[PDB]
Symmetry: C2
Subunit: 312 residues, 2 copies
C-alpha cells in the first residue's frame, strides 16, 4: 500500500531553528542544462511537487525546500533549487547550511570548501572540521542611514537601509522587548513597519521594495539579539544570514566592527550565527557561520485519491 | 548509515483528516508501565514529556498538529490504546486524530474494516472502519443550551447564534454578511475573535457560566448542506469541518427538527474538505456520529541529535 503512493525522500533539518526540507529523490527528471532552466522547468511543468512539499498539510510558512541536483559546473559538489510555499527562491543561506550538513551526514562530502550551483550562479560554503559551515554571502552594503518612518500605532522609528542579498530596514530597538514570548507583539509591529515603509515610499536602491525588517537589541552573551520579519509575515527563527550580512555592512560602515573581527548574532530563539567581513569598495564581503542539525529522514507520501494530495 | 543512528529515532506516520494533521507515533517513545491509558498519559506528562515536545514543538511540529501515541491495547475488547497531545499539552479525546489513527493502522496492515474499540485516557471511543475506507467516530453526547442569542460585535451590530455543547462550547451563527472562503480567513479570524471577546464581555456563556471558546459560522454550499469557518482557542481555525463543532451543529439541527434522526448532514469546511454527520436521540441530548477520511502524508523517522540545543523542541 505505501508502495502504491508516490514517494518523495526528504531529509529535514534546521539551521538555528529555521527548517530546510532537502529533497533527495522523487521529483521529476529535469532536462534543463542550467540551474535556471531546471528551476523554470519545475515552476512551469512540475509545480505540484513544490506544492506537495511546502503547502499544508506537509509544509508550513517557515519551511524552505531544497531540491538536490547533480552539479552542472565542473567544480561544484551539486546543484540546488530552493523554494517555499509562495514560489521559488534563488539563494538561501540557511538552506545552504542545511544542505551541506545533510550531505556530510549522508557521506557525500568531507570538510573543505564546496561550490554549489544555483539558478543565479555559484555559492561557496566551507564545511569546517567541527561541522560548522561558513557561507560566503553576496557583497553587502548600507544604502541609507538613519531614515525615519512613522509606524501606525507605534510612532516614529529610525533605521538603516541595507542590502545583504535581500533589502532590510535595520532598527536599534529600545522600546520593545526582544524575547520569544513577545513574538506576537513584535510580529504585528514589524509587519506594520514593513507596510509603513512601502506606504511612505521608503525603498532600497532604484525603488526596490524593503521586504525584511530586523530589530536589534543588546544581549548578555552575544554582541546582539535580533527579531527578523520576512515575507509572508513569518519571523526568522535563526539570526538570518542575509539580514546578518546587512547588519555587518552597517557595522563596518560605522566602524563598530573591525575587519576580520567576529560578530556573534543571537536570534529570537536563542540560536546564534557568527559573522565577519572583508572590505571591497563601498561594499563588504560577509562570511556567515552557523550550524544545522538533522530533524527527520522522511518518505513523503502522495495519495492520488486525496483532494489535498498536492497541498491545500 | 552509522551516523543516522548516532541519533535517537521516532517512527511516525503523518496523515491528515480533512486538512487537520495527525502525527501517529508507532515506535520510539519510552516504555510505559501504566496499566491504563490514564496512567500512561500521566506517565508521559510527568516522566517523559520531552517526547511530546520533540514531536510537536518547532522545528518538527507546528500549531495545527496533533500527535497520537500508539499503545498496545489494555481493555480486553480493544484494537489498541492511544494518547493524544499537541504543542501545549495532552488532550483527552480527538475525533480527527482517531480517524487518522484508524486509517493509519489499516494501511500499516494492523486492522481490517469493521468496528474497532480504542482505549483512551477517558475510556472508550468507538470507531467504524467502513469497507470504502471512511471512518465513523461516535462523539460525546451533544445538546443545544440556548437558541438565537444576541451578541453585539462592534463593526457588525447584533449577531444571533445558538449556544451548544459538542465536547466544547460553541456559538453557532448562520452567517450571511461574511464570505466563508479560505482566502478571506484573515477577516474571518478577526471577526470571530472579536465575537468571542464580545460574548465574554456581554456575559454570554454555556451552562453554569462555562466560557464559550469556539465560534462557528455557517453558509450555503453548492455541494454540501453547509460550509463552515471554525475559530478555536489560540486564534486558530480548523482546517476540517471540526468533529466537536459539527456535533454541536447536529444538536442544533436535531433540536429544530431541521435534520431527521438517522439522516445524513454533509458539512464542508473552510478548506473544502467534508465530513458526514448523523444522530440518534439520547433523552434531551443526541448521540452524534461523525464520518470522515484520513489520507497518509508521510512515513517518517524523526531524528534527535544530542548536540542540538533544539533537539527536544524550541
Amino acid at each position: 500500500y505505501f508502495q502504491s503512493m508516490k514517494q518523495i525522500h526528504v531529509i529535514d533539518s534546521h539551521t538555528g531553528g529555521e527548517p530546510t526540507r532537502l529533497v533527495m529523490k522523487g521529483f521529476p527528471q529535469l532536462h534543463g542544462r542550467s540551474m535556471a532552466e531546471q528551476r523554470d522547468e519545475l515552476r512551469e511543468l512540475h509545480d505540484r511537487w513544490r506544492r506537495a512539499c511546502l503547502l499544508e498539510p506537509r509544509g508550513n510558512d517557515v519551511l524552505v525546500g531544497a531540491l538536490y541536483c547533480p552539479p552542472v559546473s565542473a567544480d561544484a559538489t551539486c546543484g540546488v533549487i530552493f523554494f517555499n510555499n509562495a514560489g521559488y527562491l534563488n539563494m538561501c543561506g540557511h538552506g545552504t547550511i542545511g544542505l551541506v550538513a545533510s550531505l556530510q551526514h549522508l557521506g557525500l562530502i568531507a570538510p573543505g570548501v564546496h561550490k554549489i550551483d544555483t539558478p543565479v550562479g555559484q555559492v561557496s560554503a566551507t564545511l569546517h572540521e567541527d561541522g560548522a559551515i561558513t557561507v560566503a554571502n553576496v557583497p553587502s552594503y548600507r544604502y541609507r542611514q538613519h531614515v525615519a518612518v512613522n509606524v501606525p500605532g507605534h510612532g516614529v522609528v529610525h533605521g538603516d537601509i541595507a542590502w545583504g542579498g535581500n533589502w532590510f530596514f535595520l532598527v536599534a530597538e529600545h522600546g520593545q522587548r526582544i524575547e520569544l514570548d513577545n513574538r506576537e507583539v513584535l510580529t504585528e509591529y514589524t509587519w506594520a513597519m514593513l507596510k509603513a515603509l512601502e506606504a511612505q515610499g521608503i525603498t532600497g536602491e532604484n525603488g526596490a521594495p524593503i521586504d525584511h525588517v530586523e530589530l536589534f537589541a543588546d544581549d548578555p552573551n552575544a554582541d546582539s539579539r535580533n527579531f527578523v520579519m520576512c515575507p509572508g509575515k513569518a519571523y526568522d527563527r535563526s539570526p538570518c544570514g542575509t539580514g546578518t550580512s546587512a547588519k555587518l555592512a552597517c557595522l563596518a560602515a560605522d566602524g563598530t566592527l573591525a575587519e576580520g573581527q567576529t560578530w556573534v548574532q543571537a536570534s529570537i530563539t536563542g540560536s546564534q550565527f557568527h559573522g565577519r567581513y572583508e572590505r571591497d569598495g563601498e561594499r563588504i564581503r560577509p562570511f556567515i557561520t552557523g550550524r544545522a542539525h538533522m530533524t527527520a529522514d522522511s518518505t513523503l507520501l502522495i495519495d492520488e485519491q486525496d483532494p489535498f494530495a498536492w497541498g491545500i
